[PDB]
Design a binder for this molecule. Sequence first.
Ligand SMILES: Cc1cc2nc3c(=O)[nH]c(=O)nc-3n(C[C@H](O)[C@H](O)[C@H](O)COP(=O)(O)OP(=O)(O)OC[C@H]3O[C@@H](n4cnc5c(N)ncnc54)[C@H](O)[C@@H]3O)c2cc1C
Ligand SMILES: Cc1cc2nc3c(=O)[nH]c(=O)nc-3n(C[C@H](O)[C@H](O)[C@H](O)COP(=O)(O)OP(=O)(O)OC[C@H]3O[C@@H](n4cnc5c(N)ncnc54)[C@H](O)[C@@H]3O)c2cc1C
Ligand SMILES: NC(=O)C1=CN([C@@H]2O[C@H](COP(=O)(O)OP(=O)(O)OC[C@H]3O[C@@H](n4cnc5c(N)ncnc54)[C@H](O)[C@@H]3O)[C@@H](O)[C@H]2O)C=CC1
Ligand SMILES: NC(=O)C1=CN([C@@H]2O[C@H](COP(=O)(O)OP(=O)(O)OC[C@H]3O[C@@H](n4cnc5c(N)ncnc54)[C@H](O)[C@@H]3O)[C@@H](O)[C@H]2O)C=CC1
Lengths: 521, 521
Amino acid sequence: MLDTNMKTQLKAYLEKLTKPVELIATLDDSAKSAEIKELLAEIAELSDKVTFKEDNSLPVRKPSFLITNPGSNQGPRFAGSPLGHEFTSLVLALLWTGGHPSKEAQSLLEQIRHIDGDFEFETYYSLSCHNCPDVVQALNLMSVLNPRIKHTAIDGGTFQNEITDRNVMGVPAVFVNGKEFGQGRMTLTEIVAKIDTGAEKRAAEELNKRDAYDVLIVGSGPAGAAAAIYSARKGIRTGLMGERFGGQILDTVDIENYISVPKTEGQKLAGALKVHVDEYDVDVIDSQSASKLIPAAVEGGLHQIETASGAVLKARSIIVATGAKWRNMNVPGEDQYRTKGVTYCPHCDGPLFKGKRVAVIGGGNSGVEAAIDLAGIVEHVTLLEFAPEMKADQVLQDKLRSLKNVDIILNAQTTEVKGDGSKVVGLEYRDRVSGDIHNIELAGIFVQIGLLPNTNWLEGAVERNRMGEIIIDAKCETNVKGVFAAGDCTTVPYKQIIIATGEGAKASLSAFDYLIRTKTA
Amino acid sequence: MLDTNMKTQLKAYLEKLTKPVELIATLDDSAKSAEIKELLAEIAELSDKVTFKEDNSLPVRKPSFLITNPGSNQGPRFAGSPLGHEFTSLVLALLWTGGHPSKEAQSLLEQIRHIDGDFEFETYYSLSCHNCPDVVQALNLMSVLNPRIKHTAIDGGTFQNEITDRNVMGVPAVFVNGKEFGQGRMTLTEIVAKIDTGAEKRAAEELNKRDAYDVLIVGSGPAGAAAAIYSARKGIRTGLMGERFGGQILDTVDIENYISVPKTEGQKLAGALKVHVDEYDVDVIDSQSASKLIPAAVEGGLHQIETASGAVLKARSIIVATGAKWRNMNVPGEDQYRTKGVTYCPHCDGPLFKGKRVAVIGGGNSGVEAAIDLAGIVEHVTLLEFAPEMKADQVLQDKLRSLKNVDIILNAQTTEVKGDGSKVVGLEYRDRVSGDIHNIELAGIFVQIGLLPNTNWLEGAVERNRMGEIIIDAKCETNVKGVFAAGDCTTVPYKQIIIATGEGAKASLSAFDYLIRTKTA
Ligand SMILES: Cc1cc2nc3c(=O)[nH]c(=O)nc-3n(C[C@H](O)[C@H](O)[C@H](O)COP(=O)(O)OP(=O)(O)OC[C@H]3O[C@@H](n4cnc5c(N)ncnc54)[C@H](O)[C@@H]3O)c2cc1C
Ligand SMILES: Cc1cc2nc3c(=O)[nH]c(=O)nc-3n(C[C@H](O)[C@H](O)[C@H](O)COP(=O)(O)OP(=O)(O)OC[C@H]3O[C@@H](n4cnc5c(N)ncnc54)[C@H](O)[C@@H]3O)c2cc1C
Ligand SMILES: NC(=O)C1=CN([C@@H]2O[C@H](COP(=O)(O)OP(=O)(O)OC[C@H]3O[C@@H](n4cnc5c(N)ncnc54)[C@H](O)[C@@H]3O)[C@@H](O)[C@H]2O)C=CC1
Ligand SMILES: NC(=O)C1=CN([C@@H]2O[C@H](COP(=O)(O)OP(=O)(O)OC[C@H]3O[C@@H](n4cnc5c(N)ncnc54)[C@H](O)[C@@H]3O)[C@@H](O)[C@H]2O)C=CC1
């Protein structure tokens, strides 16, 4: 039922065919079936690339035909007349099946190819339906890109029959696997959303496709945040990635040494950092965890970060700001009395125990230095050391043994933190030698057994000291060009919020200075 | 008119006399005069240390007598009867004149000796006056300690005459130099205040007498303040001295990079630092200027700071935090448009000129680096260099010559900053070669001619680099033990508030670590 212009115009399009096309028909003795036989022979006529063939014993619509390549059973099937407004759809299904390319978003297309679930679409149209082609053409394209997406297009002029049976009251009307999918004007983009629950992952492929950063900051505590603020203010493209925005300050309550602010709270401060961050153009990336640094192979290259989630981000410069973890005793009551008398930091919380008894756990330099600090402020200090002797510098031991409100206990292993449901009232320990159990009354317990930088994931990539800290010069430079570090994860001597933010700012200004010094066209 | 017990009791006191005493009398033919002749002979009788003598031709009260040493005319004069309630006063004037010491505050006493103005006190008393001795004894003491303080004590029983003439209506009644001084119960301490306007200076001697500090921080900008906060929280004795609390932040308006605080103001922030400081036990000392450091001569000693005002403060540890000054162009309009388009700091104020034209003054690394920064953010940058060529690193010059929104001008000397009464609209300069004058339209002018640390006053005391910065290691340690430095006055690579506070905190924790490591009984 091709007219003069469709025939001549189709001859033009058909010479685009790089591949062989077969139209496989399944037909009864109906007038319409003859209508369709005729049509297919008319098209086979117009190119040696197209051959027409019958198989009338197949479990499908009569009349219908498949458009495929030789040997495949993959491609769009029309049932009824593929003309009317759908002539362009017919041409197009032929063209694609014979290797003319889609006009579409290539990315969308590869998305379609790699899709797991099975699917059997069916669209209802009528020849006069001005809107049905885009939808038909959309879903035809799918059947060609992936064999697990079947698509039959149904002309309602033939099966006025079936329109009734599924009570379709308006066309185009799409169905998936028997279930009603939707109707009216749906672009390819919208159908593909609806269909694939898909990979949730691609924040992942989403990360992989983002552009290289001028600077990418890893770790979003105080240090990383300060870095980000200083970076974005120079207008360079900046990314701040980390596991959990706020870092260690999220798990603290009272903070009295964030200079200028007499008293704030961990949560308030983390939120105030977020707000200060969001004033600038910063790609903030939360709950991602860096698992490797790949240093640039050349002086104008890109550094790369891998994430535990599998993604790879790229940057001209990196700032690592992953902080550290204070070693826990791991004993019953510890978790329960964090911030309620169990603390990890004498500078932070010392003044809160004037008049009170406290313990320090750890006989290293950390603890011993902590006990002398606390001794000056508190009514009494007990230091518990796990081993038979203290690890501290002798000159610190002497000094701590000099004082008159301190007790040192050796071989002592804390077994329990004791509170009253609200706050610490004591401590329980074991003599590791005798196995006997002892009890102390106190209000504060300062754990000073060790810091652990969050830097194992950099082994071999940048240089660390013997405690895991990333070595930096005053400019926050590591031993790899273009890679900087700030905060508790570095060799910086003291671990504090106001110190962390400062280093962050420094690292960023060094990063900027590096970027501008390094280009050479 | 001495009775048995006064005579015997006075014999006891008189053997305390280490020095010779003379009582010089001036007398008429009155009964009272005879009363007084008698009395003086009775006392001369009681010790060979006391001789009595007459000179009846003297321009003074009759009867009166002076109590002095041989040859002097210095000491207290009584007129009328020195008995009654005033017997103890008489004894005491004799004792002091013969070298028994005062019961008083020695410091108060030396204060009295060194006092410049002349003064002629006169006190009115009556014998029955129970309160007059303390006052009489007070002012007698003065006449002995300093010859420019005269004091006659007047018994109103003799000159009931004079009581009338000066309408004294209640005793004790003191007079200075004819003028009425006051009356009733005045301790020595209160008379001495009233009398000497004195040295205002002694904040000065007041500083000199204060106890050694555990730590003394010099300079009270952001860095010194942070140091002080961290120090006092360890409860050590801490002093913060500086020229003007707040440092450079007092002369700035908008601050958008004090991390966590999106927008504050110089004045607000300085005040918020003061408040955070005053939460702790910190001796704050304002408007004092350090002019020299004297390093301890031994490892447990004291460092000393001299002040321009002459005082010397002492400390076991020092933190220098004296900051820096940005070089001014020194041209008309500069002062007028500070904070209104003339600025000293691209990191600080860069984002405020998006879309605007600006100039950078200075072709060093500072300026050149600034111009590249600004180039990325602003519509156009002009750099003016005073000399025939830029001092910047070649690699920075190339990079700045690469850009498409920058102009470089050589031999250019800015003559005027032009505003509209409210903000900068342009700039005027001189070609130093031709002498011709040029004009530029712009909104911002970034002066980058040089930083000058405020450290000349340390020449020879601690090591500085070739730009005057105090050299520090990561722990803020200088090349003198126990001396630390923080902030813009050091080698720290970038000059910012948040960086300054961090260093301050670090310096303090290092100072503390030094104190506790250094004692050895
Ligand atoms: C309970 C407690 C109380 C404290 N109280 C005070 C106080 O009163 N005053 C004070 O000055 N300081 C206090 N501190 C210390 C202060 O919180 C830290 O020194 C500071 O938070 C360190 O800043 P930072 O950004 O360098 O590191 P962090 O705060 O440790 O932040 C680093 C961030 O990076 C994340 N990260 C780690 N590894 C990775 C990775 N591989 N990839 C991505 N992200 C990663 C971490 O999860 C964290 O979110 C306290 C600390 C604790 C634990
Ligand atoms: C106009 C202007 C705007 C700025 N804007 C910003 C901004 O938006 N953001 C930002 O991060 N930074 C900004 N800064 C920079 C910031 O103010 C400084 O980096 C910071 O104040 C330095 O801190 P500091 O305590 O080390 O030194 P200072 O702030 O310089 O303070 C040192 C103090 O010590 C005093 N002192 C000096 N010599 C002596 C002596 N011999 N004895 C006693 N006292 C002495 C000084 O008078 C001063 O009071 C700006 C600076 C200026 C000038
Ligand atoms: N200001 C300075 O220069 C400082 C230097 N340092 C140095 O850096 C490193 C860090 O020192 P520290 O943090 O003290 O580490 P450390 O390993 O030297 O000290 C840890 C201590 O904890 C003890 N311990 C472990 N588990 C215990 C438990 N459950 N109960 C009681 N005690 C337990 C160990 O016996 C040891 O004495 C050290 O090598 C030290 O020399 C430490 C702090 C500051
Ligand atoms: N990131 C880094 O490593 C940095 C390094 N530096 C170094 O530290 C030092 C500080 O550098 P700068 O502050 O740039 O000092 P500088 O002395 O090198 O630069 C000052 C410049 O100002 C110019 N100048 C002076 N008065 C002028 C006026 N009225 N008008 C116009 N121009 C005028 C001089 O000709 C000179 O080019 C330098 O020695 C530099 O090498 C400087 C900045 C940062």
